[PDB]
Each structure stands twice: as structure tokens, then as C-alpha cells.
Amino acid sequence: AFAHFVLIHTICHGAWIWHKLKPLLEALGHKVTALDLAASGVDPRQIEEIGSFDEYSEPLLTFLEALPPGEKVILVGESCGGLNIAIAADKYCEKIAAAVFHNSVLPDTEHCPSYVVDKLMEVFPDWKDTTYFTYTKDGKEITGLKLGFTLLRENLYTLCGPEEYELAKMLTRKGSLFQNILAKRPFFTKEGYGSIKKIYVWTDQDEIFLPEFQLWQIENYKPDKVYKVEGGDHKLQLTKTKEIAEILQEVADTYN
Amino acid sequence: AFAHFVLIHTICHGAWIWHKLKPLLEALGHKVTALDLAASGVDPRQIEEIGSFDEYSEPLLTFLEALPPGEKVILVGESCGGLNIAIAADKYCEKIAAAVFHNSVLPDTEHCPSYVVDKLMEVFPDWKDTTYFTYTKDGKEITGLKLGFTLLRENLYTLCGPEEYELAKMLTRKGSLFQNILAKRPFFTKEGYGSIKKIYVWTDQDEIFLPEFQLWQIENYKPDKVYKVEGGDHKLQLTKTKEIAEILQEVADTYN
């Protein structure tokens, strides 16, 4: 079967991270949309204009809003993109056939929206040469970050080629986790987000979303299906692109 | 010998086009700077803010202005980047060891600055699915363009892999040739631009800067050295990355 996959990058990244996977999925016959979220990739906004993870999610919400009635998509979120998935599913659950988490945060409905980010920061406290700053938006102080090039090289792009790591150095931008804003956000709903099918894809060789974290997330909020990819690195859509496409094909054949 | 290469993308592109060549040059021991020009790549400006090719060149001029006395670079410009080279050389000629034209326009000092663009538009009049718009800046009507995806696929990225063409679809932005502004600009100077060493690199399999155009440019304004790369496509830094590095090494060993 064919599906429309909507690929959702993580903070400080853009659609460009999907530049290998998107043509491969298209070569299997799928439709693929790879969005730039707010203040990401070639989006014209800067992060200091964005006040919350919800506002950061606008391009995804707008895209979903534009789907004609009856059209459903499979969302695919990497790393912090799982929070964009949860936000989207609480507005447009009827348009989501399934959500695929790709070395991603997996929010739940019983704890506040910051819960799995808080845990991530306990498991992986040292972001190496990443730099931080603060800005104010809508009366709140927001911590921005710019991912350090050593962190990128060693922990996110560990096994990626030099030409892929170069893209990351060139294209990663200032971003934010909006952790303190998530901490005060209404909880993700059982009727929206809680109802969607959730497929969790990961590798135990991820050097930033470490096994203790990912296995903690799976036990915290049981996915409908788990796929473990052997080898690769945090950026499985670069290091294990074919295996990810293979998994996404199966998802398309299972969930509609 | 080692050099500091400054890589200059063409209109509608960004530093990202150099993502294969930059690490290769670094693997030979060079220093490499790959800039985003105004309103290009992840630069925060939009094209409608930019009024001339000189203003478009600002990041290059600022970078050159920041070089301490005595430091010289080798500029490398692809496609329309040769006009950024000429603008830069009329301000900072003493900081330029050489300029390398990479399937690039080659402005001169005897004709107005638009001369080789006017000729390009005669040789290659049909930009396929490229779209155009107009905006006004500093009292002039400027023609903007967004490169068509068929043009990209067939004429610029002809032999590039699907994952490279995908990057182009994702990351190319609205831009401008500023042709009518170039047409009224003071001529490039003999003392500045005219004095710099000019190395012209091309392939006769370029499907947009066609052989008639490139050979016309070489006869119009004789380069100090010509290198013809066999095969590849317009984006030689993607299809012939090693050959381009090889040539740039020789340039570094010849010109300082």
C-alpha cells in the first residue's frame, strides 16, 4: 500500500535531515511531505519570535489543516519531533493514520508535557559545546540553544559521513526545547493524542537518546509496535535509511 | 601548500551546495569558509529586502573586512558567484590571492557589469518551470525568481544523485540576478578586479552554462588559467568533487 508520510525534524534541524529518506520513500510509491517547522531550516522566522512548542509546530498544524476531508497521513518525528506529533494529534487526530517515533521523545497523557524532556535531561545532562541564551516572549523567559559542533559530531551524527555532518554544521540553527513552557502546558489528551497508533523505532547505538532513556520511554507509555534497528546512530534516516524505509512500508501496510 | 578557500554559492543557493567539497579540502589541510550570501541558505533576510548584487554580496564583504592584515584567500564562485567575486575584488583586492570560477559567470572590465548575464540569457533563454515575480527596492523594480524543480533536475543537477537533488528542492530559495541593477552599476575596475588572478574551471557537459556560453566567456576575457573537467554536470562540486579539490590544490600551490 501507499501512504502520505509527513516527516518532522527535531529542534535546531529542518526538512533537510530527510533528504535521503524522502526520495527512497517516493521510490516505493509514497507521497512524502518534509516540513520546516517555525524558525527552522529555511523558514523565515527566528527562534526569538516563537513562544512555545505549539507555536513552533505551526507549519505542521497548517499543513494538516489543509488536508481535504478523508485524507489521512502517517506522521514520522525524529528526536524532539514527538512533541510536535502530540500537539498535532490533539488538533487533527482524525487525519492521522499512525505516528512513527524515530529515536524520538514519546510524550504521554498521564504526566505533564515536559515529563519526557525532564527525564532526557537527567539521562543526558552534558550537551558538550552546545551554547545557550535566553530571550523573552509572551512574558516568559525561554532558553535557546545552539547545538555544539562536537556534540553534533560525536553524539548525533556519530556514524554519518563527513558530507552529512557538514550539512549539520552549515544548516543547524538556534532553537529551543521550550521546556518551561511545556511544563505549564495543558496535558496531551487521551481522546486526541492518546487515541492514535504509535510505532516506536529506535537503535540501542544512539549516543544521545541513550538506551536507558528510550527503554524508559517504552515502559512509561507502551507503544502499539516497537521496531529496533540494529547499528547506525541517532540519525537513522542517514545511517539506516533503507531500514527506516522498510519499516515505514510495513507501517503503511498495517495502519490506515 | 595550504590556503584559505572562500566558497561562494550562486543565486537561490547557499553554503550547503559545498557540503561535499568543504570536508574534502579540509582533508587536504586547507582552511575553508562557505558563506551564505544575503537572503540565501539560512541567512535571515528575504530577497525583497535586497536591492542590488552589491547588497546581496554583504556577507562576503563583511568576511573579507574581518581578515587581519596580510591574510589572503582564494575565492571560489559557482555560476552567478563570479559577480560576487568581482564586487569583492573591487573592495578587497589585496586580500585575494586568486579567484576560481566554477562553471561561473566571468565579468570583465570593458563592458557593463550585466554584460555576461545579458549573454547568458541569449544562450539559455528558457528556464523551464522557473517562476518570476517583481518587487520594489530603493525605487527600482527587481525581478525575483524561484528556480523550477524541472530545471533543477534536468539542467543544474543533471547527474547528481536523488539525495542531492532533494537538498536542492528543499533548500533553494527565491533570489534575483539583479540584472537591471547590474546594467546601471559602475564598471568593475581594472585596478581591483582586473588585477586579480583568474582561474576558469568548467565542463562541456554543463546543461545550463552551455559550451557556447562558457567558451564565449573565455574568449571575451582571457583567464590566467583554464581547467576543463571531463564529464559531470553543472554542479561539479557534487558530481566531480575530487577533481575540483585536485584543481584547487594546484591553484593553492601556484598562487599566493
Q: List, as one string, the DSSP characters of chain B.
A: ---EEEEE--TT--GGGGTTHHHHHHHTT-EEEEE--TTSTT-S--GGG--SHHHHTHHHHHHHHTSPTT--EEEEEEETHHHHHHHHHHHHGGGEEEEEEEEE----SSS-TTHHHHHHHHHS---TT-EEEEEEETTEEEEEEE--HHHIIIIISTTS-HHHHHHHHHH---EE--HHHHHHSPPPPTTTGGGS-EEEEE-TT-SSS-HHHHHHHHHHS--SEEEEPPS--S-HHHHSHHHHHHHHHHHHHH--
Q: B 11-30 residues with CB below 8 A of A?
A: 14-16, 19-20, 22-23, 27
DSSP category for residue A110: S
Identify the closest residue of chain B to A165 by CA–CA distance: B19
Q: Hey, are the CB atoms on A171 and B42 less than 8 Å from each other? A: yes
Contact list, B21 vs chain A (CB under 8 Å)? none
Residues 6+ apart with CB under 8 A from B85: B8, B75, B77, B99, B101, B104, B193
Nearest by CB to B167, from A19, A46, A165: name it: A19
- Exactly one of A40, A52, A57, A79 is catalytic; name it: A79
Q: For residue A8, what are the β-bridge partners?
A: A35, A77
Q: List the resolution, Å.
A: 1.2
Compute the distance between CA of residue B252 and CA of residue B98 in angstroms, rounded to an integer. Answer: 9
Q: Binding site annotation covers B79?
A: yes
| Residues A211 and A236: beta-carbon distance below 8 Å | no
SS (H, E, C) B163-232: HHHHHHHHHCCCEECCHHHHHHCCCCCCCCHHHCCEEEEECCCCCCCCHHHHHHHHHHCCCCEEEECCCC
What are the percentages of helix, strand and coil residues in chain A, rounded to 5?
A: 40, 20, 40
- How do A73-79 and A4-8 pair as beta strands? parallel
Grid coordinates representing A105 are 521523545
Which conformational region is residue A114 in: left (phi greater than 0), alpha (psi within -120 to 50 degrees), or beta?
alpha
- Three cell numbers, residue A251: 507501517
Considering only CB atoms, which chain A residues are within 8 Å of B14? 170
Distance from CA of A139 to the nearest CA of B (A): 24
Given the candidates 3.20.20.70, 3.40.50.1820, 3.40.720.10, 3.30.1490.190, the CATH classification of the domain at A1-256 is: 3.40.50.1820
| A15 interaction partners in chain B (CB closer than 8 Å) | 170
Distance between B175 CA and the closest CA of chain A, angstroms: 13
Neighbours of B181 (CB within 10 A): 23
Active site residue B79: yes
B17 vs chain A: nearest CA distance in angstroms?
9
> In whole angstroms, what is the distance from residue A251 CA to residue A197 CA?
10
Residue with cell 525605487: B139
Q: How many Å apart are CA B187 and CA B109, to the nearest integer?
A: 6
d(CA A242, CA A28): 11
B173 touches chain A (CB under 8 A): yes
* b/e sequence B55-93, b meaning 16+ C-beta within 10 Å: bbbbbbbebbeebeeeeebbbbbbbbbbbbbbbbbbbbe
CB contact under 8 A, B20 and A163: yes
Which residues numbered 130-169 in B keep a CB inside 8 Å of some CB on A? 162-167
The technique is X-ray
CB atoms within 10 A of CB A191: 10
A41: chain B residues, CB-CB within 8 Å: 42, 170-171
Inter-chain contact A170–B44, Cβ cutoff 8 Å?
Answer: no
Q: How many CB atoms lie within 10 A of CB B185?
A: 16
What length does chain A have?
Answer: 256
- Cβ atoms B12, B172 nearer than 8 A: yes
Q: Are strands B225-228 and B198-202 parallel, antiparallel or unpaired?
A: parallel
Q: In B96-127, which positions are buried (b, 16+ CB within 10 angstroms) versus exposed (e)?
A: bbbbbbbbbbbbbbeebbbbbbebbeeeeeeb
In this complex, the residue of B27, B42, B163 whose CB is nearest that of residue A20 is B163
B241 is in an annotated binding site: no
CA distance B48 to chain A (A): 12
- Of B224, B220, B237, B206, nearest in space to B118 by CA: B220
Q: Which of A9, A16, A26, A42 to mutate to test the interface with B (most CBs of B within 10 A)?
A: A42
CA B186 to chain centre: 20
Closest listed residue to residue B105, CA positions, set B125, B121, B83, B88: B83
Q: Is A234 known to be catalytic?
A: yes
Answer yes or no: are the C-beta atoms of A182 and A112 closer than 8 Å: yes
Q: How far is Cα A40 from Cα A35, in angstroms, rounded to an integer?
A: 9
Contact B25, B245 (CB under 8 A): yes
Cell numbers given for B10: 550562486
Q: What is the DSSP string of A63-85?
A: HHHTSPTT--EEEEEEETHHHHH
Inter-chain touch B19–A167, beta carbons under 8 Å: yes
Q: How is A154-184 classified by DSSP, letter by letter? A: IIISTTS-HHHHHHHHHH---EE--HHHHHH
Q: Please give the single-letter amino acid code of residue A32.
A: V
Cβ neighbors of A32 (< 8 A, separation 6 or more) are: A4, A5, A6, A7, A18, A22, A25, A26
